[PDB]
Amino acid sequence: MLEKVVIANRGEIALRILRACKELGIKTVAVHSTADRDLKHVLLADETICIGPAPSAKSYLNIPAIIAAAEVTGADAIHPGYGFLSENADFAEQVERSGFTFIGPTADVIRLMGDKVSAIKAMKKAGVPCVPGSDGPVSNDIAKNKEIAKRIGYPIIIKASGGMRVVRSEDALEESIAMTKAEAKAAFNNDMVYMEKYLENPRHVEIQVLADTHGNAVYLAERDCSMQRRHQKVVEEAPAPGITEEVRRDIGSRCANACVEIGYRGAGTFEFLYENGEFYFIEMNTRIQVEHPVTEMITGVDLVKEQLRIAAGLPISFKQEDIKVKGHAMECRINAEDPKTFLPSPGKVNHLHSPGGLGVRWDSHVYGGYTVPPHYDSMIAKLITYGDTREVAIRRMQNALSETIIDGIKTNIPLHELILEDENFQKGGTNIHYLEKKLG
């Protein structure tokens, strides 16, 4: 099985992985930048290796330096966490070919679900409901485009398969496609674009799944990620309000079927749009996500532990029927940023006071005297609460945040406090545009 794992990430996720590894007696190699010598997970690691200077491009995206670090320590596997190289098939390919286990799916399954039209193909095939759309790439024959666009009706949206554009009227279609195409070739190398029916007030609802090398696959309810700001999630909860065991079972089961159809491997998320009682699949994340803890709180599954087990060729430690959703969980992403302008706020944390008590979980690499660096994201902590009901999780989050002291830098804690007392948020079922409007 796995005796030594390279942690090819940083911050809170590298510590989350270290904690999992230590619990299983798996030896940890922490690959780190110059600027990340002082990370909690790095100081707690069994072996450490500087893989290059502060910029992520010459460190955490340094495919050769990480593989090299695996070769030298005689590592068995590599955990890419989230972001960086986690969705990079070329990296996954270079890992498997160099004789190590990539903790996550196989290269050909990453490429497949990385391309959104071919991903959408798979989900239609598995009986999984998708957005009314082009059902494939759209051609430059614009007569044929108007036809599909007028079938689904306006507004429509044009997305890249591997930077999207809302079209409100037929008058602005022809140009609006050729634009989106030309941006992609110059940017993402791939001129391929597809149409969907643009949903104006959807909720963002994600199903968590696990698939193993034994042919088992499970769904672990959903998360509502609707409370976001310009493509950055701010609060997450599980389960998603309004969604029943009946609907959870159905679309949950269909995501589990799909995992097997495509020979999916490890932890993964099916993202959905949710409007007017109906689910519409949009894309799939082939990795562990930031907001995994809220799912852990309501299922008592250790998603990173199962990632390690699955990667070692073990079956998932439990069966679909052993999972029951109990209570409700909230995660506030605590960022070192100005709570109104969202300008990063790096520098020394002088005093940290973590909250605690019943139903309060604190996932953070930050400690008193830790300097939040400029070179990466602004996330410093994930504050997660559990309650028997949505009300208690919210009230518990409120008390937890007013207990949280972070001196020396600004945080978005005042933002979280605003959201948690918002009457619409308390009511629940706020769509994906709510936070932007409220900040007006």
Ligand SMILES: Nc1ncc2cc(-c3c(Cl)cccc3-c3cccnc3)c(N3C[C@@H]4[C@@H](N)[C@@H]4C3)nc2n1
């Ligand atoms: N057909 C259709 N209709 C509505 C959509 C809304 C979003 C979206 C989401 Cl899910 C969250 C936050 C913002 C948006 C979004 C993106 C572009 C324009 N308007 C809203 C959206 N997104 C697709 C992809 C998510 N990871 C990011 C944003 N796709 C949509 N597709």
